[PDB]
Design a protein around this nucleic acid. Structure first.
Length: 1339
RNA sequence: UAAAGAUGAGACGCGUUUUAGAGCUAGAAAUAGCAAGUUAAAAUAAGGCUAGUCCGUUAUCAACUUGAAAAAGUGGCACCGAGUCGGUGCUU
DNA sequence: CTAATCGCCAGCGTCTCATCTTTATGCGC
DNA sequence: TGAGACGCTGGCGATTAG
């Protein structure tokens, strides 16, 4: 029947759609309504939008999955410790583990004894008095040699096992080398022995061993090198200090005889690199590295261990005990001093928990920073507190043991303390002597990152492979899991497959077969520039074999370009040459039977990065190489993966045999790929063998983009399917697809807007301009375009020798420099600042030859001073090159038309594949539907030029309006110019020479295909008149027709009125997508105990009345329940009930038992209605409400403000922000000032809409009073506040807003009683099909 | 070459809740005046069967009619108009 | 004696390792 | 070798209103 087109607009939170005919009209249609509402037919229009919530990434779930694994592994460690200790623990105390486990319970629910450790009050308080902290006991067990009971040893060891510090340091640490000055003196003596010169450096010795300053990580290796003049940092000593300071050294160049000695003490490659390093140097430098390692350790552990090293072997214990003692001393001093000086503040400081005193610091939730900030003015006004204020500046004033900065402690200190415990307690306990290695391994064990979860196949994240079927335990880990296979699968399960055969794995990038392919199938026959002969293309089989074997093999370098003359520029062939450099044998690689061996070798070197894994993998390959060869090989690693598989080349027959002029000298790889005789048939069979029945969801999943847009793509597909079903099951003619611009860019640009001031300051400094003192560098002037241009121009005219400065804004012009082809560029790269003088004499270029010749020197100086960008300078100097040529115009056409984003073409391909599914006799695609992609700039310029302004704060109609404008612009563009389909329409089309078939010499005169473009603006045919750079106006015909046909594509008279009638249309289908809420069960905070019934138990038997718990659960969906409830008497009731996320499965198991357990009786099974979030209700007078929760409601109506008021608001708000000709600005200012009375009409409209649907009388009266009291203020700020005023009538959740100074809070609808007697609406994705149910008839 | 984003794995330090760490003196008490604060146990989504040193906050989801599910199917057109859509004519 | 309204509240910091895309863009020339 | 913090919207206790 009729033909139609569909326009779309994909966004993050909205999808707009529209259906237009051939003359840009939106059809209307009568639709059938189901249900029982006695309203059989409704009339709707084919325009609307869909609204939904954004998608979420899996990061927040992953960060909790890792935490759950960490917690259960820690519990397993504690269980292992209990299991080993239980045998000897049974005789000492049979219920000690039970008292430890049940310690959370309250006294009346506990069994055994309340006191966990000893079981009696006097022993418990004696232990607490003897050991205030656990570190007292830990240091006592480290130092004392006396026998102690097993309980204290168990608690100490359990503390070390549960808290063990970080694993960021490889190797072992000796804490006995804590003396920084002794290490520095030892290093100085070592260099005094090693160096030929007697001094260590030019600075001599000054004992400046205080290198523990705050931060200053590489500032030791720089600044102490500045306090050690001499070899500085590039010398041998500077590299050694940087090695001790942790920075990467350069012994290859600074030190002598070292080929490469890049080392790091923390890294596990240390001493493995140093063996090879010291192989090439003498024993003189060997003794220096031990001192360097000692100094590095001394610097490293001095952050934590602030105690003398000659005390004991528990320095962490010593530091914590001295902190505890300092805390006690300063607490006593503070108490005495406060009581002597300020007695009235003692109660507040030491008793009130709600302040930031000591009571709030300990019992309350205050931090040490809050406590310091609160107590600093008191100590400042307080006398005798100089040392206290000094220690406050060093933040060692009442520090606790469990502090946030304890994460810097490595596990070696805890291992040393545990080893001291074991070594001093073996003799008393034989079972403690017998399992020292097991305890140490329990502390030090760690699962490698390439092994993954240790599942048995029921996990969708695991890849670890078992060599045996038994329980994995930390003392038999090395003989159960296959480390090499697991480390291989760790890489392989995340690398992509081959495009040609999507069932085979790709090859390593540095693989020898791949290198042979790159030098064989390419760089041969026609691919070579000269092919080593007079003819650039020849077969030359044996000749090119000899060329590959001699010119490229054993000679591949930069010299291949010169060497190829006698017998490509990108062929490298480097892996084989590195293999020659390592092996120094030329038989394995020359023999072709060993190719699998070399491929396996490069595969292992690419797969594995750990040094231990490579040696274990190559241990089985040790029958043909020696120890030096293995040492050279294990230090070499590659990276990167190719794009082609293995059986693509060797399995398919081979292609490696047939390439390079053996079969054909015509780039045989691509021809053989496209040859369907023997190769492309198998590829087509493999590609068709994919089980892509659900290809929509699979292709969506494999997209490269955010889930927030991957949701919108799927919703767009479903919307198009529903529209095609609606419109008589007829396919559309054209589909226009537009991707909305990002919203995060506005805030990021606002944050980065101050960079213009920094750039202006840097340019003024580079140019040495003294005019910077007359202006400030504040961001206020940066937002002004005229001020920014005056700053960038350094007070001089950009097209004249006169001075402009900041004298007057009216004596300046902002004319662009490239309007000849009308690229429509408004950025500062195309802007320029000059006086009112035009300084031009032609339209083909804004700058003239005389102007260019005059200002070339100043332009060159500004370009050298980084004041003018390269593109701007080239455009300014393009006048001498002969103006805008055909290539420049073609580039302008391409830039205006062709989009570059990669996701738009994927969406277009998805919709094209879903639409066009017909093949011809020659298997050609029948492209009956054209999919068109457009840029946002065209539609935005259309709205700006033809006064179709938008305001996003009024209603949600602008999504549908954007979709409709997309449709009309795309259809008009495809109707007028059918010769440019290859640029902006998806499909297979022959390209055209834009420089020839889309260009004209002058005035676009002549025959067909030359009247396309003389001015490169695309949207020029819409305007009734156009103006050049000068003051000349060229008119246009009223009816725009095709050049090669009589078809009418645009009427200036009638078509604008139709678009205006569409944009003032009141009924637009806005649908909010209902979604069942999922996520967390409740809020994560654990609340203290109380008697309220809103608390949620944290376990099965933990009563919230006695233990606290969570509250605020999240409701998945609500259900309408009609039943009868006892009141001693049964009374019928109809009410809603909120099914939370935690009980959703229990409700769906058996709803009858669920409502019986909740107290409802005699419920009706068939009357249960599932009501998800954002369900819609009708009520009275069109007052719609959206169900936000089981006891909340949301606004659900839309305000249809007229387009005259929308235009007036947009003009009034941008009163000083509009960009255009100064003649046009005065007209708009007069238009705003001539219609001041519209504001009262807008307020009346808001009041009339609010009194019917909103019902917010108090807020409405406050709004009216605030509007009345601010009438004298000017129209600009008044309209800017009236835009804020629309938050009252917006759709969705209520929110607060401001009107000048007064703040209006939110009015919330906290009762769902009124919706029980309304009409529920179930609507489809487009909202065209509805099913209305009258709930008042239920019961 | 750098930056960003999306995935997956292994670890650390805190925090928050109950319990243990005997408070003293004066009254008939209500309450007042003193002393002490630094630590430890357990839990960290309730739980599940496939019983693993696994899994549990991502994606997907109007109504009705079939089907265990996957999945499939269900709604006339034209013309005047417009306050969230109405009216008229033809037809089934 | 129950229902409507006002004010408050929301678990958080760090390190190591691996894979893939996409968008600017520098060096050489 | 670094930007700086809000912002959101439903639940809950305490208070007022009819």
């Amino acid at each position: 029947d009729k033909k139609y087109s569909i326009g779309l607009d994909i966004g993050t939170n909205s999808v707009g759609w529209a259906v237009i005919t051939d003359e840009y009209k939106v059809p209307s249609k009568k639709f059938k309504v189901l249900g029982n509402t006695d309203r059989h037919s409704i009339k709707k229009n084919l325009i609307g939008a869909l609204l939904f919530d954004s998608g979420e990434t899996a990061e927040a779930t992953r960060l909790k999955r890792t935490a759950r694994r960490r917690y259960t592994r820690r519990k397993n460690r504690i269980c292992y410790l209990q299991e080993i200790f239980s045998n000897e623990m049974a005789k000492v105390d049979d219920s000690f583990f039970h008292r430890l486990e049940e310690s959370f319970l309250v006294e009346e629910d506990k069994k055994h004894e309340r006191h966990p450790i000893f079981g009696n009050i006097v022993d418990e308080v004696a232990y607490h008095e003897k050991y205030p902290t656990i570190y007292h006991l830990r240091k006592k067990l480290v130092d004392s040699t006396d026998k102690a009971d097993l309980r204290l040893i168990y608690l100490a060891l359990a503390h070390m096992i549960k808290f063990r510090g970080h694993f960021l340091i490889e190797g072992d640490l000796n804490p006995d080398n804590s003396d920084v000055d002794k290490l520095f003196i030892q290093l100085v003596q070592t260099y005094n022995q090693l160096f030929e010169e007697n001094p260590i450096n030019a600075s001599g010795v000054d004992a400046k061993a205080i290198l523990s300053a705050r931060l200053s990580k590489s500032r030791r290796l720089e600044n102490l090198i500045a306090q050690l003049p001499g070899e500085k940092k590039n010398g041998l000593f500077g590299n050694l200090i940087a090695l001790s300071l942790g920075l990467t050294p350069n012994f290859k160049s600074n030190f002598d005889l070292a080929e490469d000695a890049k080392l790091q003490l923390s890294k596990d490659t240390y001493d493995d690199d140093l063996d090879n390093l010291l192989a090439q140097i003498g024993d003189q430098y060997a003794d220096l590295f031990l001192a360097a390692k000692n100094l590095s350790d001394a610097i490293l552990l001095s952050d934590i261990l602030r105690v003398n090293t000659e005390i004991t072997k528990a320095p962490l214990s010593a530091s914590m005990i001295k902190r505890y003692d300092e805390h006690h001393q300063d607490l006593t001093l503070l108490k005495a001093l406060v009581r002597q000086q300020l007695p009235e503040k003692y109660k507040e400081i030491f008793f009130d928990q709600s302040k930031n005193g000591y009571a709030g610091y300990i019992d309350g939730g205050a931090s040490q920073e809050e406590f310091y900030k609160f107590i600093k003015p008191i100590l400042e006004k307080m006398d005798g507190t100089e040392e206290l204020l000094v220690k406050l500046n060093r933040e060692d004033l009442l520090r606790k043991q469990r502090t946030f900065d304890n994460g810097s402690i490595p596990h070696q200190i805890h291992l040393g303390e545990l080893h001291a415990i074991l070594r001093r307690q073996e003799d008393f306990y034989p079972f403690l002597k017998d399992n020292r290695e097991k305890i140490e391994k329990i502390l030090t064990f760690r699962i490698p990152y390439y092994v993954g979860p240790l599942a048995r196949g029921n996990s969708r994240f695991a890849w670890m492979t078992r060599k045996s079927e038994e329980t994995i335990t930390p003392w038999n880990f090395e003989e159960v899991v296959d480390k090499g296979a697991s480390a291989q699968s760790f890489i392989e399960r995340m690398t992509n497959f081959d495009k040609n055969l999507p069932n085979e794995k790709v090859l390593p990038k540095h693989s020898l077969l791949y290198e042979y392919f790159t030098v064989y199938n390419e760089l041969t026959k026609v691919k070579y520039v000269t092919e080593g002969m007079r003819k650039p293309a020849f077969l030359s089989g044996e000749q090119k074999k000899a060329i590959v074997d001699l010119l490229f093999k054993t000679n591949r370098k930069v010299t291949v370009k010169q060497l190829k003359e006698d017998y490509r520029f990108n062929a490298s062939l480097g892996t084989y040459h590195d293999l020659l450099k390592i092996i120094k044998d030329k038989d394995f690689l020359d023999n072709e039977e060993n190719e699998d061996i070399l491929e396996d070798i490069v595969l292992t070197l690419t797969l594995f990065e750990d040094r231990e894994m490579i040696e274990e993998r190559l241990k089985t390959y040790a029958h043909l190489f020696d120890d030096k060869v293995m040492k050279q090989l294990k230090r070499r690693r590659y990276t990167g993966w190719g794009r082609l598989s293995r059986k693509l080349i060797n399995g398919i027959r081979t292609i490696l045999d047939f390439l390079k002029s053996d079969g054909f000298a015509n780039r045989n790889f691509m021809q053989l790929i496209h040859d369907d005789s023997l190769t492309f048939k198998e590829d087509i069979q493999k590609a068709q063998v994919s089980g892509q029945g659900d290809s929509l969801h699979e292709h969506i999943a494999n997209l490269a983009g955010s889930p927030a847009i991957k949701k919108g793509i799927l919703q767009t597909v479903k919307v198009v399917d529903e529209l095609v079903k609606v419109m008589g099951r007829h396919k559309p003619e054209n589909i226009v697809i537009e991707m909305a611009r990002e919203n995060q860019t506005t805030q990021k640009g606002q944050k980065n807007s101050r960079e213009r001031m920094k750039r202006i300051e840097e340019g003024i400094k580079e140019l040495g301009s003294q005019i910077l003192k007359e202006h400030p560098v504040e961001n206020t002037q940066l937002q002004n375009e005229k001020l920014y241009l005056y700053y960038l121009q350094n007070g001089r005219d950009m097209y004249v020798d006169q001075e402009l400065d900041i004298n007057r804004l009216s004596d300046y012009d902002v004319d662009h420099i490239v309007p000849q082809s009308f690229l429509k560029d408004d950025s500062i790269d195309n802007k320029v600042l000059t006086r009112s003088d035009k300084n031009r004499g032609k339209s083909d270029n804004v700058p003239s030859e005389e102007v260019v010749k005059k200002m070339k020197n100043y332009w060159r100086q500004l370009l050298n001073a980084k004041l003018i960008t390269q593109r701007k300078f080239d455009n300014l100097t393009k006048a001498e090159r002969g103006g805008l040529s055909e290539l420049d115009k073609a580039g302008f056409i391409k830039r205006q038309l062709v989009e570059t984003r990669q996701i738009t073409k994927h969406v277009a391909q998805i919709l094209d594949s879903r639409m066009n599914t017909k093949y011809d006799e020659n298997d050609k695609l029948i492209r009956e539907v054209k999919v068109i992609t457009l840029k946002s700039k065209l539609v935005s310029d259309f709205r700006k030029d033809f006064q179709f302004y938008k305001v996003r704060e009024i209603n949600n109609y602008h999504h549908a309006h954007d979709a409709y404008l997309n449709a009309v612009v795309g259809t008009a563009l495809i109707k007028k110019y059918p010769k440019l389909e290859s640029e902006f329409v998806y499909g297979d089309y022959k390209v055209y020479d834009v420089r020839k078939m889309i260009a004209k010499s002058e005035q676009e005169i002549g025959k067909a295909t030359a009247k396309y473009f003389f001015y490169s603006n695309i949207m020029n045919f819409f305007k009734t008149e156009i103006t050049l750079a000068n003051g000349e106006i060229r008119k246009r015909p009223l009816i725009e027709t095709n050049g090669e046909t009589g078809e009418i594509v645009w009427d200036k008279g009638r078509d604008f009125a139709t678009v205006r009638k569409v944009l003032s249309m009141p009924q637009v289908n806005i649908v909010k997508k209902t979604e069942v809420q999922t996520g967390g069960f409740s809020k994560e905070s654990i609340l203290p105990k109380r008697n309220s019934d809103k608390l949620i138990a944290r376990k099965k038997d933990w009563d919230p009345k006695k233990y606290g718990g969570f509250d605020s659960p999240t409701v998945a969906y609500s259900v309408l329940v009609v039943a009868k409830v006892e009141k001693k008497k049964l009374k019928s009731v109809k009410e809603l009930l909120g099914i939370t996320i935690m009980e959703r499965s229990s409700f769906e198991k058996n709803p009858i038992d669920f409502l019986e357990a909740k107290g409802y009786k005699e419920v009706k099974k068939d009357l249960i209605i599932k009501l998800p979030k954002y369900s819609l209700f009708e009520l009275e007078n069109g007052r719609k409400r959206m169900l936000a929760s089981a006891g909340e409601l949301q606004k659900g109506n839309e305000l249809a403000l007229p387009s005259k008021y929308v235009n007036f608001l947009y003009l009034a708000s941008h009163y000083e922000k509009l960009k255009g000709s100064p003649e046009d600005n005065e007209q708009k200012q007069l238009f705003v000032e001539q219609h001041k009375h519209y504001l009262d009409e807008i307020i009346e409209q808001i009041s009339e809409f609010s009194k019917r649907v909103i019902l917010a009388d108090a807020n409405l009266d406050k709004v009216l009073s605030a509007y009345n009291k601010h009438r004298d203020k000017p129209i600009r700020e008044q309209a800017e506040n009236i835009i804020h005023l629309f938050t009252l009538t917006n759709l969705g959740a209520p929110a607060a807003f401001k009107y000048f100074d007064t703040t209006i809070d939110r009015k919330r609808y906290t009762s769902t009683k009124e919706v029980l007697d309304a009409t529920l609406i179930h609507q489809s994705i487009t909202g065209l099909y509805e099913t209305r149910i009258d709930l008042s008839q239920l019961g």
